[PDB]
Ligand binder design. Structure first.
Ligand SMILES: [K+]
Ligand SMILES: [K+]
Ligand SMILES: [K+]
Ligand SMILES: [K+]
Ligand SMILES: [K+]
Ligand SMILES: [K+]
Ligand SMILES: [K+]
Ligand SMILES: [K+]
Ligand SMILES: [K+]
Ligand SMILES: [K+]
Ligand SMILES: [K+]
Ligand SMILES: [K+]
Ligand SMILES: [K+]
Ligand SMILES: [K+]
Ligand SMILES: [K+]
Ligand SMILES: [K+]
Ligand SMILES: [K+]
Ligand SMILES: [K+]
Ligand SMILES: [K+]
Ligand SMILES: [K+]
Ligand SMILES: [K+]
Ligand SMILES: [K+]
Ligand SMILES: [K+]
Ligand SMILES: [K+]
Ligand SMILES: [K+]
Ligand SMILES: [K+]
Ligand SMILES: [K+]
Ligand SMILES: [K+]
Ligand SMILES: [K+]
Ligand SMILES: [K+]
Ligand SMILES: [K+]
Ligand SMILES: [K+]
Ligand SMILES: [K+]
Ligand SMILES: [K+]
Ligand SMILES: [K+]
Ligand SMILES: [K+]
Ligand SMILES: [K+]
Ligand SMILES: [K+]
Ligand SMILES: [K+]
Ligand SMILES: [K+]
Ligand SMILES: [K+]
Ligand SMILES: [K+]
Ligand SMILES: [K+]
Ligand SMILES: [K+]
Ligand SMILES: [K+]
Ligand SMILES: [K+]
Ligand SMILES: [K+]
Ligand SMILES: [K+]
Ligand SMILES: [Mg+2]
Ligand SMILES: [Mg+2]
Ligand SMILES: [Mg+2]
Ligand SMILES: [Mg+2]
Ligand SMILES: [Mg+2]
Ligand SMILES: [Mg+2]
Ligand SMILES: [Mg+2]
Ligand SMILES: [Mg+2]
Ligand SMILES: [Mg+2]
Ligand SMILES: [Mg+2]
Ligand SMILES: [Mg+2]
Ligand SMILES: [Mg+2]
Ligand SMILES: [Mg+2]
Ligand SMILES: [Mg+2]
Ligand SMILES: [Mg+2]
Ligand SMILES: [Mg+2]
Ligand SMILES: [Mg+2]
Ligand SMILES: [Mg+2]
Ligand SMILES: [Mg+2]
Ligand SMILES: [Mg+2]
Ligand SMILES: [Mg+2]
Ligand SMILES: [Mg+2]
Ligand SMILES: [Mg+2]
Ligand SMILES: [Mg+2]
Ligand SMILES: [Mg+2]
Ligand SMILES: [Mg+2]
Ligand SMILES: [Mg+2]
Ligand SMILES: [Mg+2]
Ligand SMILES: [Mg+2]
Ligand SMILES: [Mg+2]
Ligand SMILES: [Mg+2]
Ligand SMILES: [Mg+2]
Ligand SMILES: [Mg+2]
Ligand SMILES: [Mg+2]
Ligand SMILES: [Mg+2]
Ligand SMILES: [Mg+2]
Ligand SMILES: [Mg+2]
Ligand SMILES: [Mg+2]
Ligand SMILES: [Mg+2]
Ligand SMILES: [Mg+2]
Ligand SMILES: [Mg+2]
Ligand SMILES: [Mg+2]
Ligand SMILES: [Mg+2]
Ligand SMILES: [Mg+2]
Ligand SMILES: [Mg+2]
Ligand SMILES: [Mg+2]
Ligand SMILES: [Mg+2]
Ligand SMILES: [Mg+2]
Ligand SMILES: [Mg+2]
Ligand SMILES: [Mg+2]
Ligand SMILES: [Mg+2]
Ligand SMILES: [Mg+2]
Ligand SMILES: [Mg+2]
Ligand SMILES: [Mg+2]
Ligand SMILES: [Mg+2]
Ligand SMILES: [Mg+2]
Ligand SMILES: [Mg+2]
Ligand SMILES: [Mg+2]
Ligand SMILES: [Mg+2]
Ligand SMILES: [Mg+2]
Ligand SMILES: [Mg+2]
Ligand SMILES: [Mg+2]
Ligand SMILES: [Mg+2]
Ligand SMILES: [Mg+2]
Ligand SMILES: [Mg+2]
Ligand SMILES: [Mg+2]
Ligand SMILES: [Mg+2]
Ligand SMILES: [Mg+2]
Ligand SMILES: [Mg+2]
Ligand SMILES: [Mg+2]
Ligand SMILES: [Mg+2]
Ligand SMILES: [Mg+2]
Ligand SMILES: [Mg+2]
Ligand SMILES: [Mg+2]
Ligand SMILES: [Mg+2]
Ligand SMILES: [Mg+2]
Ligand SMILES: [Mg+2]
Ligand SMILES: [Mg+2]
Ligand SMILES: [Mg+2]
Ligand SMILES: [Mg+2]
Ligand SMILES: [Mg+2]
Ligand SMILES: [Mg+2]
Ligand SMILES: [Mg+2]
Ligand SMILES: [Mg+2]
Ligand SMILES: [Mg+2]
Ligand SMILES: [Mg+2]
Ligand SMILES: [Mg+2]
Ligand SMILES: [Mg+2]
Ligand SMILES: [Mg+2]
Ligand SMILES: [Mg+2]
Ligand SMILES: [Mg+2]
Ligand SMILES: [Mg+2]
Ligand SMILES: [Mg+2]
Ligand SMILES: [Mg+2]
Ligand SMILES: [Mg+2]
Ligand SMILES: [Mg+2]
Ligand SMILES: [Mg+2]
Ligand SMILES: [Mg+2]
Ligand SMILES: [Mg+2]
Ligand SMILES: [Mg+2]
Ligand SMILES: [Mg+2]
Ligand SMILES: [Mg+2]
Ligand SMILES: [Mg+2]
Lengths: 117, 150
RNA sequence: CACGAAACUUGCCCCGAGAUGAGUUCUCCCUGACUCCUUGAGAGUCCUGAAGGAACGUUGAAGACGACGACGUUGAUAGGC
RNA sequence: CGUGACGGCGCGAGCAGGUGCGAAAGCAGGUCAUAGUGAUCCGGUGGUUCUGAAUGGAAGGGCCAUCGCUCAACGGAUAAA
RNA sequence: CGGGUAAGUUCCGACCUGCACGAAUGGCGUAAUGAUGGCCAGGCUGUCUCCACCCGAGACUCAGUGAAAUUGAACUCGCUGUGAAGAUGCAGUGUACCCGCGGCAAGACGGAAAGACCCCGUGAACCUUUACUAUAGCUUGACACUGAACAUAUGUUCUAACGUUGGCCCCUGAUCGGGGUUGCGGACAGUGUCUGGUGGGUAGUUUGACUGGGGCGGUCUCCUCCUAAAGAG
RNA sequence: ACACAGCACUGUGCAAACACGAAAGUGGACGUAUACGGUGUGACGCCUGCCCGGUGCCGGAAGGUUAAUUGAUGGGGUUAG
RNA sequence: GAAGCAACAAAUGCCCUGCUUCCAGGAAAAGCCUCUAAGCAUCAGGUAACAUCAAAUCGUACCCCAAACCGACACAGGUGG
RNA sequence: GGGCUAAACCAUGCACCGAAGCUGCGGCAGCGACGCGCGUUGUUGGGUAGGGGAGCGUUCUGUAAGCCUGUGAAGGUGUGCUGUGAGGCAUGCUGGAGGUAUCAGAAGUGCGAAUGCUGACAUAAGUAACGAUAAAGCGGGUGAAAAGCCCGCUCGCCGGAAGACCAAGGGUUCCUGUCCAACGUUAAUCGGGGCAGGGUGAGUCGACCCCUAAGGCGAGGCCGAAAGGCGUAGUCGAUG
RNA sequence: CCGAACCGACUAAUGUUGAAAAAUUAGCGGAUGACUUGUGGCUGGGGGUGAAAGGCCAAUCAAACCGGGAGAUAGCUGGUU
RNA sequence: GGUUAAGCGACUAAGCGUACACGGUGGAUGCCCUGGCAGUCAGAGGCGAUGAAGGACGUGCUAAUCUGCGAUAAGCGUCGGUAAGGUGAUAUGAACCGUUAUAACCGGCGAUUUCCGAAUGGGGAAACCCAGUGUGUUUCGACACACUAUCAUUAACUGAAUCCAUAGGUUAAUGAGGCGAACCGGGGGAACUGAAACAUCUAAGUACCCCGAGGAAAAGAAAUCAACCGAGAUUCCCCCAGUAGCGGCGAGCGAACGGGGAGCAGCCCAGAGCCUGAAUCAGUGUGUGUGUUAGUGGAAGCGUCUGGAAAGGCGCGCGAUACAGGGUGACAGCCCCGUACACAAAAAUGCACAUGCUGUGAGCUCGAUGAGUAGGGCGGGACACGUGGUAUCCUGUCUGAAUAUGGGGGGACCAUCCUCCAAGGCUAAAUACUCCUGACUGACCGAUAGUGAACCAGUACCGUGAGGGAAAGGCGAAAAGAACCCCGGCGAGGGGAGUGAAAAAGAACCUGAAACCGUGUACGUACAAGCAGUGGGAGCACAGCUGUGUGACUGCGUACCUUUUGUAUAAUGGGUCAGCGACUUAUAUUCUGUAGCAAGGUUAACCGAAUAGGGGAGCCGAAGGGAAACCGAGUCUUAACUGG
């Protein structure tokens, strides 16, 4: 029972090279190099599903800060004021409102200022 | 492998991986690392397990209605056409026929029918009893099998 | 508030606007027609072809090659004489 | 019961037999205690209700007591570097 | 110390305090000789001060042909730091438009060869010897081939075993061989088996470990104290 | 450095010592001590001192010790009695 | 199809396998010449002249200090007369 | 790092940022309870050496004289869907005759490394080099094409050789015609290249032959476990 | 003795993926001798041969090459889908 | 409106990247088998002086090579078979042969059979050189044929020293030699290695060298075992048993007795008499059977659909003692060749009978009963057994009995008893092997695999030589292998045309992967610093807000393997791709899972036609303790246990 490896080996190598499309040079052409590149891309993607949640919150906070200071209050006092007023809107939504509904955001700032006073 | 025992090149200095034999299984045309030898693949079956399996198989043939018992089964002449007609009358196609004594005319008439086999009771085997659609036994063969399996 | 050295910043010589922060000044040149489209710093055809450049040639106290300089009959660029 | 991976090594009341000292209760299985040591193999000597290659014996073997290594590189590769 | 030089760790001549000369593993001299070692001088010069120019063959350009070592992948800068402890690739920062061609070798711990030094392996080989164990050879005796007398194991004589790489004869056209004969040796010699000695001539091997690298030195088992952190270790 | 002519020691009486060779043989040599082998020294000149305890070689052979061989004597096993 | 001679110089080639001289003292066998033995005897055989026949077979091109041989090469090398 | 006289340090306080920690929402698995494989519940799930558990796929045997397939098999190449993964399924194009469910059975059963082995193809790079610095110039010819071939004139180089001729060694390289793929370090009409035909004439040259050297073999022989060793008579052996 | 052929190999430069796995160029030593060379022969691997360097014995030498014991062994390094 | 100013700003691509499309290169993959690999059942177990194996050179209508053959040269004669076609392959052509039986083809028996090679007339650098003698023949030049080696044995003749003799010499007859894969008997005989070093020991009487034989060899008819009962030559298999023992008592080595099987067979000389030619083998003839070497007959299918082609689909039939297998334009019981079955031999030959002929001796009686031997001393070797307390066997050396009223053995030795008869020999079967021939088979390979070799391979090539040693398979069903035209050098190469189902099947030919190299298009890219991705993300292009391609700008981010305390490491390994490349196999043993049976379980060899059935020889378990005798649910210890 001799087993030739060609058909199965070709499928495995092709599966990796398909995942390497778009990479530069040997990284999209040469199995040895493409395999390492596909593994590293997987490691980065695992890491960056966690990083993505950090980077977006960081972006929302920066935009809330700018919109709050346009209305005369810092980010840190604004958040504390909302919490004292029992408002549970999260930063993703606060940043959305800060860009698309400046009148509603001003109303939220006034609510935060009243709870702080 | 046919070839000489000469070291292909010296141990050190050439810049090649070290070689010792042209017959290394690493090399094209080299030996097979664990080359096969002729083998005996037969297994031991305990006597009582062989007989136990036969009794299990025959009992299942009865429950599945694949065992047909007849008083006699024979043909007048060693003619394939006669046995084909006889089997067509009894609505049989793929059948093992177990007789008490091997009728010479019956054995010859069945040779060229590829779905049909004819044995004496002493020559039954477990795979044949499972492999055929139906099993026809003469009353005489039934007794012989009973006595054989106690 | 004032003096104070071959060190520092200048003064002297050379490079230098790819200084993408791409600078300034002087001078020269080009002043047609039409069609299509998804309609815009859009595409195409016809007519036009400037100032200037390059190429080629004869060449150089310029030169590895490129580059740089001189000259091309309205001419001394090279050889000859 | 202690102490060791193990091979081992250590402490031990009490029981049987026989003994010394003491009037007796008692004490005595070496020495105030902790170093003073060498596995196995191979053989030596004495003992022995064991074994004894046809049988009776015997040889040889076993068992009990004991002897031979600065195998000191001291868990000791060889009789011999 | 003297000589030579402006200046001489070399050279030449001396001294004797010869670490550690010395008489055939020769001592001290020695004409001639040496692609032999050291030192000095004349001549000579691009050896040099200190390089310049020139003539040729490459290098450079064009046409034709057309290699090589190397190579994980590259979008392949400097600095200071960091860090498997000497960074193009990390951190911070500076600088930097894209791409050739001729040159130069400071770095890519550049290429080349599984470091030859050092250590390790209960690795190897060959060499040495008063390492161990053997052994060819050499040497000793006993018995065998191997006998006869006489005298006192020894000695003398004898011939018939045995030796003859003395003469002669034959096979025979033959400096081999064999046979015959004669002389000389002669129970000796030589050979077999056994045996003591000798035996680097030859062979197989051994020649420990710990260790602030290895060697050298010290150590290697047992007892007591301390280190030992108030149970043991 | 090796060789070298020269020098010395030493072995060798011829079937030479010595060497190749299980052996037969062959070289040494169709030579014969003015010859042949081994060893050291290294033209030539002037020379070459003392030590024989160690290791080797040579000679000695009275004694001590000692091999194979020989098998006195003693002891044991067996058992006719 | 003319002339097609002389003189002089001259080998490392020839005379010369000589001659002279020296010590290190310089193959073999046949062809060839000669002598006889056994033998043969006006035979054979020998010598000379003449005639006649035979002399087979294989090699023979080409390179040979080289591009053809030895160096893997149309290779700066090597190759006796 | 920029910069900072606080954006430094001390003290007190309240905010906020901040992790794959905790919480929220959805999903999977291990272990244990509790009930009837299911439910419920609690809890756990970073891992090298290594132990344990459960699987994917490949070739081959049976099931299989079955099933799929020229109305298009295997293989190749795309696309879509699908599972926690190894993977699976469908289908366009290519291909043009094989393939094989299920449940079992057996293994030459899975590759990126071993300075691994074989083949193919890169890089450096159109880079180094084109093999003695004796040297070329021109006219004519032939030709698709001429620096290199042929003819001519000139120039230069060797001439105790770079000339002539043998032995050895090689073996057709010799001559003529024809061809230019490959070979020739370029081109080639030329060649020691391809193809075809031709060419080597002996009594006297050489070999063979007669004769021997060193040496070899060697009837008998002598010697040796065997194989063999030595050698006599002889017989070979040129470099004579 | 001086110096070509011939036999060597002291110095320097070049070359070092060479023209060459030891050469080329300019110089250098011997050059009637212990000289050099052609052809053939003989000595064989613990063996040969060696004016001696462990030199040489077919580009191989402190034990040649080829085949075999043979998949020696590898407490080491690498690799292991 | 224009001018000026300030600010912002697309369109560039020398080249490069990613994606896609289409190609080139290359030869993976799949599919394929006139080649291998392993066996089973049979056959044959040799060939050679009557010249082998293996070669050289020849041989055709032939230039070469292969195959065949040998100057009678791809062949000649004859007897048989068979026949409508044929003159082997490359390989067409030419000239021919044949069709009812001398074409060809197949088989038996013959003929021919150069040269080298044991090589044999001498020599020799294999395939060449040179002879002697005798018969003939001759045209006087010469030609043909046959003999001529060595050694052994035998015989004849001859014949030394030397008188007889012997040695020696000549001749004749008969035999031998050389080659071949394994198996077999004998003469010699390693080391690596293991012992964690190494010397005893091991490896191992292995490898290797040598001599000799046969189809088998060897061994073999008790001076054997046993144990007081008995067995009854040798050989082979399964047990006994990894036991008893051996052993630097280390590493290791390792029986026998006894039991189950295969197979079975006994005889002769050492000597006379009687009786005789009687058994028995060998040879040679002849018969009868039975094989072997050529051969003969051998059943049964059409229509229609798809298609280049049908054997496939669908429909309806038929044969089968034949549905083994192969082929045919895709998959055929019925197209072809076969297959089952039934038949066949002029000639040669194997076997088993029969019957001749030849040799051989059968039986009875009475005798005889293997001496430098057994044994011993010394040195070695062999026995599982290493000198040990060491029996037994062999013998290099030195010795040395009794001989049937005797002798050998029973594991030191003695006694007793038992058993056997050495020093002479022959002998089938069961056993070992396969260069070679035929048939069949495979959970064996399928072109880097399987033989080194699927192919003109032990070749090319390498080496002085011994020796080493490749790569290289596939057009199509059929060559129908591309007439003719065009560019080109009367090229190479290509474009058309034509063939074909297909020509990206066109001979550099099935499929045609990857690395690698191009052309085209979309997007990006010339102020920009690093493992080249990942998270975010504008713009553009494309297809239907989404899907696809691209990716300005931006957060984070130093490859993989190995080895390490620890590697971005400037430590190791890899230029890339494709293919191959490493925990296996056998036996023993223990544990787990699972299945059967259960105080039992199970057979081995072997028998059997048997995957059945037989076979229980054995092995494990149901009892232990003790060194052992022994005792036994106990036993050992000790005088004995409160005990342990
Ligand atoms: K391979
Ligand atoms: K049937
Ligand atoms: K500017
Ligand atoms: K002028
Ligand atoms: K016994
Ligand atoms: K120790
Ligand atoms: K001396
Ligand atoms: K000198
Ligand atoms: K940085
Ligand atoms: K550099
Ligand atoms: K050691
Ligand atoms: K060595
Ligand atoms: K004597
Ligand atoms: K010695
Ligand atoms: K330390
Ligand atoms: K240190
Ligand atoms: K303490
Ligand atoms: K020397
Ligand atoms: K003098
Ligand atoms: K003198
Ligand atoms: K002395
Ligand atoms: K002395
Ligand atoms: K000629
Ligand atoms: K497909
Ligand atoms: K690799
Ligand atoms: K290139
Ligand atoms: K060339
Ligand atoms: K050219
Ligand atoms: K030597
Ligand atoms: K060689
Ligand atoms: K050797
Ligand atoms: K572009
Ligand atoms: K490709
Ligand atoms: K012959
Ligand atoms: K050994
Ligand atoms: K070891
Ligand atoms: K060792
Ligand atoms: K068929
Ligand atoms: K013994
Ligand atoms: K091979
Ligand atoms: K092969
Ligand atoms: K095709
Ligand atoms: K292709
Ligand atoms: K990024
Ligand atoms: K690695
Ligand atoms: K390491
Ligand atoms: K390390
Ligand atoms: K390194
Ligand atoms: Mg297969
Ligand atoms: Mg893979
Ligand atoms: Mg690619
Ligand atoms: Mg790609
Ligand atoms: Mg070897
Ligand atoms: Mg193979
Ligand atoms: Mg059974
Ligand atoms: Mg000044
Ligand atoms: Mg310039
Ligand atoms: Mg006291
Ligand atoms: Mg005390
Ligand atoms: Mg002992
Ligand atoms: Mg007894
Ligand atoms: Mg110790
Ligand atoms: Mg001075
Ligand atoms: Mg002085
Ligand atoms: Mg001295
Ligand atoms: Mg002296
Ligand atoms: Mg002295
Ligand atoms: Mg002295
Ligand atoms: Mg001296
Ligand atoms: Mg000299
Ligand atoms: Mg640094
Ligand atoms: Mg440089
Ligand atoms: Mg380096
Ligand atoms: Mg190393
Ligand atoms: Mg030694
Ligand atoms: Mg140490
Ligand atoms: Mg010390
Ligand atoms: Mg303590
Ligand atoms: Mg404590
Ligand atoms: Mg002599
Ligand atoms: Mg000296
Ligand atoms: Mg002269
Ligand atoms: Mg000629
Ligand atoms: Mg040339
Ligand atoms: Mg040349
Ligand atoms: Mg978080
Ligand atoms: Mg969490
Ligand atoms: Mg966790
Ligand atoms: Mg985990
Ligand atoms: Mg299948
Ligand atoms: Mg398949
Ligand atoms: Mg299946
Ligand atoms: Mg595999
Ligand atoms: Mg791969
Ligand atoms: Mg790996
Ligand atoms: Mg490499
Ligand atoms: Mg070019
Ligand atoms: Mg370059
Ligand atoms: Mg250049
Ligand atoms: Mg150049
Ligand atoms: Mg040239
Ligand atoms: Mg020229
Ligand atoms: Mg030719
Ligand atoms: Mg020519
Ligand atoms: Mg020609
Ligand atoms: Mg060319
Ligand atoms: Mg030619
Ligand atoms: Mg001889
Ligand atoms: Mg002889
Ligand atoms: Mg002669
Ligand atoms: Mg001659
Ligand atoms: Mg020399
Ligand atoms: Mg001179
Ligand atoms: Mg040898
Ligand atoms: Mg030395
Ligand atoms: Mg050499
Ligand atoms: Mg050696
Ligand atoms: Mg071995
Ligand atoms: Mg190995
Ligand atoms: Mg001969
Ligand atoms: Mg002859
Ligand atoms: Mg002759
Ligand atoms: Mg060992
Ligand atoms: Mg026999
Ligand atoms: Mg038929
Ligand atoms: Mg049909
Ligand atoms: Mg087809
Ligand atoms: Mg007898
Ligand atoms: Mg005896
Ligand atoms: Mg004896
Ligand atoms: Mg006895
Ligand atoms: Mg006994
Ligand atoms: Mg192959
Ligand atoms: Mg293939
Ligand atoms: Mg050759
Ligand atoms: Mg096909
Ligand atoms: Mg194709
Ligand atoms: Mg800038
Ligand atoms: Mg830009
Ligand atoms: Mg960059
Ligand atoms: Mg970053
Ligand atoms: Mg480290
Ligand atoms: Mg790190
Ligand atoms: Mg580092
Ligand atoms: Mg780096
Ligand atoms: Mg690295
Ligand atoms: Mg590594
Ligand atoms: Mg390493
Ligand atoms: Mg390392
Ligand atoms: Mg590397
Ligand atoms: Mg018991």
């Amino acid at each position: 029972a001799r087993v030739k490896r060609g058909v199965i080996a070709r499928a495995r190598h092709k599966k990796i090279l398909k995942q390497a499309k778009g990479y530069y040079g040997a990284r999209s052409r040469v199995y040895r190099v493409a395999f390492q590149a596909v593994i590293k891309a997987g490691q980065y993607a695992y890491r960056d599903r966690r990083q993505r949640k950090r980077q977006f919150r960081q972006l929302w906070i920066a935009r809330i800060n700018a919109a709050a200071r346009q209305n005369g209050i810092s980010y840190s006092k604004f958040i504390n004021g909302l919490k004292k007023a029992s408002v549970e809107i999260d930063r993703k939504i606060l940043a959305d409102i800060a860009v698309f509904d400046k009148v509603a955001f001003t109303a939220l700032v006034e609510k935060a200022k009243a709870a702080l006073a | 492998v046919t070839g000489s025992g000469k070291k292909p090149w010296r141990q050190k200095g050439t810049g090649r991986a070290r070689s010792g034999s042209i017959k290394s299984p690493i090399w094209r045309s080299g030996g097979v690392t664990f080359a096969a030898r002729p083998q005996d693949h037969s297994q031991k079956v305990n006597k009582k397990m062989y007989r136990g399996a036969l009794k299990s198989i025959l009992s299942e043939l009865v429950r599945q209605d694949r065992l047909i018992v007849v008083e006699k089964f024979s043909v007048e002449a060693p003619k394939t056409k006669l046995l084909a007609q006889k089997l067509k009358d009894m609505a049989l196609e793929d059948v093992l026929i177990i007789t008490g004594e091997l009728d010479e005319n019956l054995f010859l008439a069945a040779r060229n029918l590829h779905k049909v086999d004819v044995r004496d009771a002493t020559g039954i085997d477990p795979v044949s009893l499972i492999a055929f659609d139906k099993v026809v036994m003469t009353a005489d063969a039934v007794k012989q099998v009973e006595e054989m399996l106690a």
